[model samples]
Target chain A: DVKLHGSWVSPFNYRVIWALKLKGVEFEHIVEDLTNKSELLLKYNPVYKKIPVLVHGGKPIAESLVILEYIEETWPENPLLPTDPYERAMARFWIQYGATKTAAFGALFRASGEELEKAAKEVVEVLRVLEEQGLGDKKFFGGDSINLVDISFGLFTCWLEAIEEAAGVKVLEPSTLPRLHAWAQNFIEVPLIKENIPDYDKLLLHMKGVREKMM
Target chain B: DVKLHGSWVSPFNYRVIWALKLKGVEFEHIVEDLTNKSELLLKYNPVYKKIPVLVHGGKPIAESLVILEYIEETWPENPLLPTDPYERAMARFWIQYGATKTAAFGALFRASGEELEKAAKEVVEVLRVLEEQGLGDKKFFGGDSINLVDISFGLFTCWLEAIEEAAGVKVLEPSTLPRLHAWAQNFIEVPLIKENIPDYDKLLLHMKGVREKMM
Candidate 1:
């Protein structure tokens, strides 16, 4: 009754995968070719025509964070969001931050030379703010366990690192962003996250082709 | 027990206002000057340093969408989001869309000549999708009463109409987007919405200065 229409290398798809795995829910994965999207994918998500569309009990849900919320409510086994309304709003704010901050990194992908450095610098600044205000001396963004904020921010690092591997540019430098750098390491070491993430080498190769086409 | 730190002119603030008024809850409104932000406003919303922050029981929540969710959860009398998980996801999807689609209209604000026309065209396309997929044949986005989805999209139209007045450019033309124009009309006629919305002439005057600086 649970099916996910997603792409192989998308971070968004990995968001749903990690969420479902963490909640101990079994879902059949239906991978889609993003370049030539399937009708089923398009039909399930006609609004965005994007991947990571979750169809649970024949009802379709679009947007990764939205899907994550639905999964949290439906399963409610391992709570992704916090219990209190204010804390939940805080989690949503940080999750929303993760979604909105893609623009800076999106710029990093196509930029060159000084602009590339400038873009990466901008990314570092964003991470700086996130580390200062959002993370703030916490083991994880969720305090002790990995919650929706960690899930949301963690997936972006997966892409950020892949982008770092593809372009040989250092954005999330350990010396500069020590907490985030460690946060990224802590995120991957989580048994569930490690198992469910996209293949590092394959994603790197995919991104190389993507980078080559761009430059 | 609740206090809102907001700007009188901001649509985002009005979102919280409309939500509280509809829920039959009473709160104190502490106005913020956006030019020289108050320390209270800065402390409450350290992340964004923006308005429409709701401090409930001494806990602060920032971002209007996040705040709206908090309001819905705290005061469940007039339900804004649906009870069903999938319907809730759908509501969130539309609310997220309204937040994301602002980039098109933001461009329309500062653009000029052919670029301005192009920007408005992009805004029109965004609204077209909103009309077809989101609003559909529903009287409001909530199907009957105004929900959080309506609160989200409705505020944008409040600004859109003012934009039309200030720039002398009609983006949401009734001939092109008949459904949305009618939706906007019906939205304004809601007694709760009508009372809480910012003055039309004031918003238009504010935009006039905004447009003047751009040109």
Candidate 2:
């Protein structure tokens, strides 16, 4: 049995949700309020004290990316990572790249004036690298089918747009990032993802509040 | 056949070297001069334009951690990761933790005055978390034998000490981080690691130059 503890609006939380759903793994979703963090959340993730903890057979695994790998291993029916060693390395490389460069995106939500412009430029550079080096001519980061790499970068599909709107800057536009723009469009249309994401208007409201809180 | 492109004094480069040696894999090491990077290095790792890039069967995998995973998968005899799914997640959790907070260590090399003190405090906090949450009472992060987690943190074994010595900051001292300090000592004493590390005096000189350049 699998249970996932996470928040409704977290992109990290949804990454695991999509992976489990993709693998056809049945899991109980326990919603966590960041304001009043649950004892379960604290106990499950004593190290990070963060959400998206996967409790499998009563043992807790924290970190969304870590949980994604655990879910993939436990349920191998639909493989998230490629089977070939080299191909798997490539997938992991892209995933780690996205994981590390997340601060560039977060900088967008918090910066202003010259700092905001610099942050926006950094976000564009990151997206350009993802588009050219990571996505390339492929339909998805995984190519044809949505794999873990696609799932890892899934935030660009909706959350990024909301962030851009909240920050009053555009980084993922078609002119600057044509390939990534298209990939974002194609990524959200996937049945599993299309059905699972939070509503756009609601996310925009939530993100606006989050931006205000940060600023 | 395998080929590694890396700098002699780089801790990142040494990670793959240690992993390869531990797995009993033979490879040619092509030293990279960062000032005059080779075309092959750029071609192999265009995105990061960094080393060590591990090439096997004509395919190149960049990023030391990615290369470590590739090495583990390709040569599973001397398994770097634990077989149990949960254990693997725990190992990966610490590896990712170390990977993300690397800047905190770098800050020590560059900062001075109040900034240096703040950076030292931050490095100590990161070490404290690693010692408490990741290392705990385990002999190695892998427990019993050195694993990928130990290799991921291999920099702390020698390079961190060199860095501290150059910067005149003591974060990983015996008193503050006794377990991790001992683990560092034990980790370097391992035969595979002992045989592979760079000459300490030369590394100290190189690190001093790096610190000077940063300052």
Candidate 3:
């Protein structure tokens, strides 16, 4: 049996849920109260002590991208990565880039005043790269239909919205990134994504609480 | 013909060299001086304009970790990642973890005095997690022999030494992190790593120049 242990608000957790639903893989969802993490999440992700730990056949796999790859490889029913070796490399390239560079997007939640401004510049630079190099002319980051790259980037759709509302700034604008704008619309419409994402109103309220604390 | 465009003193470049050598695949290495990045390197990696671009049959692929995966998938002779889906996921987990945690180390490079002290504390905490959770007691990070995880972590053996020396603050002491230290030793001794690594004296001097500029 496959079981996913994660927090509802975590984008990382959503990555796993999207993968499982997309592949039609049935698994139990164990919602973890992160203030007191389950032994399973800790054991699965000892290094980060974080969530989105996917336990399959009694072994745990952590890291969203890693688990997504695992899900693709093990299932192979509905493929997420391109089959061509080069194309697969390209998909992996953008996914890792999104995961690594967009890390600064988290700073919007934590920083204030000057520090926030500095972080915003870095985030904008990263988004520019994403807009230009990653999205390009593709209908989706996966080129057509949502794939691992698209789902991995789904945070930009939902989380970024909440973050923009909370931080009172607009970074992922159409003028700045037309392709990403279209991709964001297409990404949210995916059945797996639409069904599983956190409610925007609730998420905005949650971000308000977080921002109040951060400020 | 297969050729790699890279720069000396770049741990990213070494990732490809080590992976190709591990797979027993031969390729010519063209060094790109970062000071004057070659037209070929720029043409290949136009997005990031960085080194360690692998050109196969006139096609180019960039990013060190992405290139590593490409090499592993292309030349499946001496496999770097495990064959089993779960095991492969474990390898990818470590790779992403290392990539994600690099911020704490980078913080050390950009900070000083009180900030440096805080960065050092963060580095120790992160390194402890890497040691206790990521490596445990394995002969190599991939178990039994050097694999993609070891190659991805090649910086710890070569570039990190320069980083610690230049910063004049050692964070990876053997007495403290015996397993990781031992892993570093084993990593450098691999035949490909042993042969292709830039001379220690030259790297140290080069890193000194870099530090002077940055600091």
Candidate 4:
């Protein structure tokens, strides 16, 4: 049995949740209120003091990517990463690219005026790379079906749109990024993802609240 | 045969080198001077335009950690990462921890006055975590011998010291963090690492020159 400590609105948290579900691993979810964090959460993840900590057989591991790998290793029935070593490395490469560029996307949430424009531009550039280099006409990053890389980018599918609406800025428009726009649509339409994502209206309202607090 | 596109004075470049050496993989090294542009390097690493790109059988992989994983997967004899899934995830967690906090350590190389003190303190906090949480009583981050986490931190064994000396601030002193200080000493003393590091006095001189330019 597995237990995941996470919150509703966090994409990092959802990344783990989706991975577990995709792997068909039954897990217990513990909602961790970030503001008033519990001692268990602290004990589980002291370094970041963050959520999405995975506890299997009472052993806790932090970090979404690390947790995803752990889950993949434990439950190899439905593989998330490519079997070949080279392909696995390439999948990891793309995942790391997304992880590192999260700040640029995040900047669009908190930025205003000139900073907002600059952050949006950087997000577009990041998307362009994701399109041309990463996606490269594949239906999924894993080609035929969803993989860890696709799950790793699950945030962009739902949460990004919420952030765009909340911030009153459009970054993932179909006009400029047709491939990514379609990928996002295809990604969410996946049954597991469609079933798991929070209500769009509720998420948008929550994102607006988060933006207001950041401002 | 493998070809590595890298530059001197780059810890990330050295990370791939050390991993290759430990794995007993023989490859050609093409040094790319950052000041001078190389079309091939740019082509290989289009997204980052950075070095330590590992080209194997005409296929190139950028990013040092990604290259290290590729090396480990391709040459599995002397494994740089642990074999078990959980163990590998833990190893990756620490390596990524180092990768993310590089900027804090880097801030020491350029900061002066109050900013320097603040940056140094932050660096100390980062070291504290590395010592207490990461190294603990282990001879190396890899326990018995060095692994990717240790190589990922190969910078601390040399470059960090040069930065500390050039900036006239000591962050990894024995008093503040005894275990990590010893780890750094032990990390460098390893036969492979000792033989491979850039000359100390020359590295110090180069770091000082770089610092002067930054100031």
Candidate 4 clashing pairs? none
Measured by TM-score, how close is model 1 to the native structure?
A: 0.94
lDDT of 4 by residue, B80-157 (tens): 778788788888888889889987876776789999999999999998998898888999989999999999987887
Best by TM-score: 4
Query: Pick by lDDT: which candidate is best?
Result: 2
Candidate 2 regions with alpha-carbon error over 4 angstroms: A112-118, B113-115
For candidate 4, the per-residue lDDT at A153 reads 84
Cα shift from native, residue A182, model 2 (Å) = 2.5
lDDT of 3 by residue, A74-105 (tens): 99987888888898888888887786676588
The residue-by-residue lDDT of candidate 4 on A117-155, one tens digit each, is 889889989989998999999999989899999999888
Q: Write the per-residue lDDT of candidate 1 for residues B43-116, one digit (tens) a residue.
A: 88877788888998888998899999999988888798889888888888988888888777777678878888
The estimated TM-scores of all candidates read 0.94, 0.95, 0.89, 0.97
Candidate 3: the clashing residue pairs are none
Model 4 gets an lDDT of 0.88
Residue B3 CA error for candidate 3 (Å)? Answer: 2.4
What is the per-residue lDDT of model 3 for residues B60-152, given as tens digits with 9 covering 90 to 100?
888888899899889889888889998788778778778877777876667778887788777777777777777899978888888888887
Candidate 2: residue B87 Cα off by (Å): 0.4
lDDT of 2 by residue, B61-118 (tens): 9999889999999999979899898899888888989987998888987899899999
Relative to the real complex, the DockQ score for model 2 comes to: 0.83
lDDT of every predicted structure (CA atoms): 0.86, 0.90, 0.83, 0.88
